[PDB]
Each structure stands twice: as structure tokens, then as C-alpha cells.
Amino acid sequence: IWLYQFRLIVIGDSTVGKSCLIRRFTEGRFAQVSDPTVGVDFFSRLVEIEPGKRIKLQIWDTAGQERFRSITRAYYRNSVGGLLLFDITNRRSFQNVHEWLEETKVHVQPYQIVFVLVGHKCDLDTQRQVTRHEAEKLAAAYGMKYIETSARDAINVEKAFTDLTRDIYELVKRGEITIQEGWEGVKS
Numbered sequence: 413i414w415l416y417q418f419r420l421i422v423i424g425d426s427t428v429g430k431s432c433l434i435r436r437f438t439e440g441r442f443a444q445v446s447d448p449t450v451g452v453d454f455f456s457r458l459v460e461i462e463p464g465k466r467i468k469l470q471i472w473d474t475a476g477q478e479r480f481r482s483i484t485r486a487y488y489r490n491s492v493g494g495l496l497l498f499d500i501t502n503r504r505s506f507q508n509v510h511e512w513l514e515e516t517k518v519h520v521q522p523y524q525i526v527f528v529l530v531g532h533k534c535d536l537d538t539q540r541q542v543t544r545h546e547a548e549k550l551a552a553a554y555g556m557k558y559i560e561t562s563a564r565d566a567i568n569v570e571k572a573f574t575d576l577t578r579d580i581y582e583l584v585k586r587g588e589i590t591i592q593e594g595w596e597g598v599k600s
């Protein structure tokens with residue numbers, strides 16, 4: 413059925429589109445109306461990364477609101493990978509990416525989380541407040557890749573999760589990430 417199970421965490425400011433991204437990926441639908449997340453919700457999906465090779469993704473949908481941050485950060489340890497969103501139409505959400513990144517950098521046990529930077533709501537092209545280039549430069553400065561997604565228009569949603577799963581899978585194949593006693597980030 414699957415080779416590995418990976419735990420992924422999706423993080424970023426409130427309202428950037430984390431829950432909608434995850435629901436488009438797992439439910440294939442766009443939630444036109446979306447309550448702010450309280451604590452951390454759970455979604456799952458199998459992905460076939462290569463023919464006959466499946467990875468189970470256990471996805472933690474985190475609350476962006478500041479008052480739930482104590483809950484969100486409790487999940488960093490047991491995550492192997494994640495997506496860090498900003499909203500391309502919300503420059504303050506981009507300004508906060510460095511803060512989200514600096515905070516994950518002190519959560520490097522058993523490993524640094526494998527992150528991709530996600531410029532979300534890329535359907536709102538005329539409302540853009542962040543250039544692709546400055547987001548690509550920020551991602552590169554933290555050694556991560558960048559992708560622009562839309563939950564509304566189903567743009568790059570499968571690719572965001574699938575590319576990150578392939579990256580983690582290759583790190584596991586090289587032994588750079590391994591199963592660890594009591595860690596839930598990777599399971600055989």
C-alpha cells in the first residue's frame with residue numbers, strides 16, 4: 413500500500429490560505445468560506461511519487477493566529493517536512509516569513525524540517541504585493557525552494573505537496589533522514 417508515511421506541517425500567518433490549500437489537496441474542493449483554525453487540524457492523502465510507489469502524507473493544518481502559537485510549535489518536532497505560506501497579496505504575511513523561519517531554526521531535533529516556501533493566492537495576480545523574485549531570493553537564502561499556489565483555481569497544489577514528498581523521499585533513500593525511536597516524522 414505505501415513505502416513510508418511522512419508527517420507534514422503547514423505554517424504561516426492567519427488568513428494566508430493554509431486550510432484552503434490543504435483542503436484543495438486532500439478534498440479536491442475550494443472552501444469559499446473558511447473559519448480560522450483553532451490549534452491544529454489533521455488531513456491525510458496517499459501520493460504516488462513514481463509508478464507503483466506511494467507515500468502516505470499525514471498533514472497538520474496549524475492555526476496562524478498568535479494566541480495559538482504555543483499549540484502550533486508543539487508539532488514542529490514530530491514533523492519531517494512542511495509548507496510555509498504567505499499570501500502574495502499581503503506584504504505583512506511575507507515580512508513575517510523570516511520570523512516563521514527563524515523560529516523553526518530552533519526546532520532542529522531530530523532534524524531541520526524540510527520546508528518549501530509557498531506564495532499562496534496566486535490567482536489574485538492583479539492584487540500582488542510581493543514579487544516572485546524577492547520570494548525566490550528569500551527562499552534561496554534559507555536554502556529552500558519557492559512555489560506559487562492557488563486553492564481557488566487549483567494551481568500548483570498537487571505539485572507543492574508532491575515535489576516536497578519526493579525531496580523527503582530522496583533524503584530518506586540517502587539516509588540523511590531516518591526513522592528515530594519515538595519520532596513520528598517518518599514511519600516505515
Ligand SMILES: Nc1nc2c(ncn2[C@@H]2O[C@H](COP(=O)(O)OP(=O)(O)NP(=O)(O)O)[C@@H](O)[C@H]2O)c(=O)[nH]1
Binds near residue numbers: 443533563
Ligand atoms: N483568492 C483566493 N482566496 C483564497 C485562497 N486560499 C484561501 N483563500 C481565502 O483566504 C481566506 C483564509 O483562508 P484559510 O485557508 O482559512 O486561511 P488560514 O491560513 O487557514 N487561516 P488560519 O491560520 O487562521 O487558520 C478565506 O477567505 C479563503 O477563501 C486562494 O488560493 N485564492
Ligand SMILES: [Mg+2]
Binds near residue numbers: 430432448449476
Ligand atoms: Mg486555517
